[PDB]
Design a protein around this ligand. Structure first.
Ligand SMILES: COc1cccc(CC(=O)N/N=C/c2c(C)cc(O)cc2O)c1
Lengths: 19, 333
């Protein structure tokens, strides 16, 4: 599932802005 | 009328924009309690104003870090804009000042924590729950854009929940007052409009694309474009091929196709009828826009009452150098 793919991804924590 | 309200909103803003508040408190006036959040330049701490016992959130920016990241003008924008705005769903800048080492922005303390925290914990919001928040962002962007301001960093991390369950937008680090178009590559990868990624020049339409991403993320529990590396995220965005969860309502999907529209001449919020294409959309049929603005609507969630709605962060001493750093750069702050 897409949800499972998200939760296993490296992008579920706070996301940095691009500076 | 709305046009009338905004015109008056603008009169108020321009006075403060042309003559910004400066040096309105000092560090020793506040007792520092605990870090509530962090960011590239520093941290935000819960503090208590000694003379009144009021609590605030003090954002502390290391001047040298700002300069290293080439964010001087952006930081000057942040403070000049925030001190000038006034809207129910925008965090208030109560005081600002600087010292040899840091810039300080003392803002309204919003006790319910980040939308990010609640969204990740609960998984996803119901459509009515998401709609309630979305409505507040729509009104806030209507206000900001009418002042020629682009926000440029919408995401759940930047949306705080107050004691009554309403949203307060924080972090104006990329906010900018601009007539026409601009070019800076800035924002958060998942939330970037295609035109930003493609270096096309862009305008306030990027905030409306970002609203689409936010609404999708609130309702799905994950954003419409994600991957372990930003490059791959950018590739997905520019394709614009979006897939919706099977539980998304027909109305929701329709709204999202119009917000997550790669074509600027078709993107909602950016057409002849502007924000009204969004307000009048079927997904918002149940939304009373005046009641939202007046905070007369019962929130779908009120936070439990104290800083337990925020994560714990590592603390560090706030050392102030005996030498002034970057004085010329931040003269106007
Ligand atoms: C780029 O450098 C940065 C350094 C520190 C912080 C940030 C991001 C920011 O403005 N957070 N605001 C948190 C906040 C909180 C947690 C509560 C509150 O009441 C008001 C706030 O602004 C960016």
């Amino acid at each position: 599932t897409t949800y499972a793919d998200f939760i296993a991804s490296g992008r579920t924590g706070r996301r940095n802005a691009i500076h | 009328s709305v046009k009338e309200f905004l015109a008056k909103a603008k009169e108020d803003f321009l006075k403060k924009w042309e003559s910004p508040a400066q040096n309105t408190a000092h560090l020793d006036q506040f007792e520092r309690i605990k870090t509530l959040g962090t960011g590239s330049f520093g941290r935000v701490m819960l503090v208590k104003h000694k003379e009144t016992g009021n609590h605030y959130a003090m954002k502390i920016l290391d001047k040298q870090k700002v300069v290293k990241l080439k964010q001087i003008e952006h930081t000057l924008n942040e403070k000049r804009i925030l001190q000038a705005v006034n809207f129910p769903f925008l965090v208030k800048l109560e005081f600002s000042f600087k010292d040899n080492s840091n810039l300080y922005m003392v803002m309204e303390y919003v006790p319910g924590g980040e939308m990010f925290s609640h969204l990740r914990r609960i998984g996803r919001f119901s459509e009515p729950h998401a709609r309630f928040y979305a409505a507040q962002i729509v009104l806030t962007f209507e206000y900001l854009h009418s002042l020629d301001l682009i926000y440029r960093d919408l995401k759940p991390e930047n949306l705080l929940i107050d004691q009554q369950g309403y949203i307060q937008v924080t972090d104006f680090g990329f906010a900018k007052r601009v007539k026409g178009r601009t070019w800076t590559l800035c924002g958060t990868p998942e939330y970037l409009a295609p035109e930003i990624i493609l270096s096309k020049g862009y305008n306030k339409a990027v905030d409306w694309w970002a609203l689409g991403v936010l609404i999708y993320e609130m309702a799905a529990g994950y954003p419409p474009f994600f991957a372990d590396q930003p490059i791959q995220i950018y590739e997905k965005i520019v394709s614009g091929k979006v897939r919706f969860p099977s539980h998304f309502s027909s109305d929701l999907k329709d709204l999202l196709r119009n917000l997550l529209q790669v074509d600027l001449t078709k993107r909602f919020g950016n057409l002849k009828n502007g924000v009204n294409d969004i307000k009048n959309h079927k997904w918002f049929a149940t939304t009373d826009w005046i009641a939202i603005y007046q905070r007369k609507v019962e929130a779908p969630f009120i936070p439990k009452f104290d800083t337990s709605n925020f994560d714990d962060y590592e603390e560090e001493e706030i050392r102030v150098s005996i030498n002034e750093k970057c004085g010329k750069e931040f003269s106007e702050f």
